[PDB]
Amino acid sequence: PNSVDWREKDVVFPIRNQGQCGSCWTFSAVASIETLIGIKEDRMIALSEQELLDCERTSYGCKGGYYTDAFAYVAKKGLTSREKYPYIFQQGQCYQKEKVVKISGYRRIPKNDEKKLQSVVAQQVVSVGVKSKSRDFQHYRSGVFSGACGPRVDHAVNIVGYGSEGGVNYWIVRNSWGTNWGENGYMRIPRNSNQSGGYCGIAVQAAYPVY
């Protein structure tokens, strides 16, 4: 398909805000699972970043983490709702509440494979990492981003679609910096860019949950 936008397909929840806590890996993992459940079951159910932040044991809480290992956690342990376990903007005691969703696993997209990346985005929402530590990235407001990226991949986000404006291909990227950043919380990043690994490294470590 020449264009994909899951925001228009009733399976993507509103933009959220992680605050200061480095919990973007939990938001990225939650966003990918929520959409998968929407596509697979025609059921929109908001899931708990907080459970991953408190309970996923390979990550570093508010000092970073792994959405791939978050996927493995949900496949083994299930995940409870956002309503049952709300986000409190800091790591706390790990609670195992009544779980509402599982997944069966996850997959890793090979490094720098934007072609395979597009194939997966046409079917579901994908977790990706970007180089977020730059003034240009933090102050992005609108358009297809063409500023400088950070030096290293350090921020978990999601790709929720792709398209083209004026013949410039782009990815639609969901962030967890609230709706005052970018285009109502989203960024359009160049697609098939001249940066190896994708623009701001978006294709370096892509992964997605398997129902």
Which of 204, 207, 173, 175 lies closest to 190 in space, CA to CA? 173
Task: State how far the Cα of 210 lies from the Cα of 207, in Å rounded to an integer.
Answer: 10
Cα dihedral across residues 152, 157, 158, 161: positive or negative: negative
- Residues designated catalytic: 24, 155, 175
Task: State how far the Cα of 134 lies from the Cα of 112, in Å rounded to an integer.
Answer: 21
As a dihedral over the C-alpha atoms of residue 193, residue 132, residue 130, residue 74, rounded to 10 degrees, the angle is -160
Going by C-beta distance under 8 Å and a sequence separation of 6 or more, which residues neighbour residue 163? 2, 3, 4, 5, 169, 170, 172, 188
Per-residue tokens: 61:
């809480």
Strand pairing category for 207-210 and 186-190? unpaired
Cα angle at 125 between 90 and 7, to 5 degrees? 90
As a dihedral over the C-alpha atoms of residue 167, residue 122, residue 7, residue 166, rounded to 10 degrees, the angle is 0
Domains of the chain with bracketed CATH: 4-210 (3.90.70.10)
Residue 93 · residue 54 · CB < 8 Å = yes
Task: State how far the Cα of 24 lies from the Cα of 178, in Å rounded to an integer.
Answer: 12
> Backbone dihedral region of 44: left (phi > 0), alpha (psi from -120 to 50 degrees) or beta?
beta
Residue 153 · residue 205 · CB < 8 Å = yes
Exp. method: X-ray
- CB-count exposure of residue 195 (10 Å: 0-12, 13-18, 19+): middle
Which of 144, 156, 198, 191 lies closest to 32 in space, CA to CA? 156
Task: State how far the Cα of 23 lies from the Cα of 20, in Å rounded to an integer.
Answer: 8
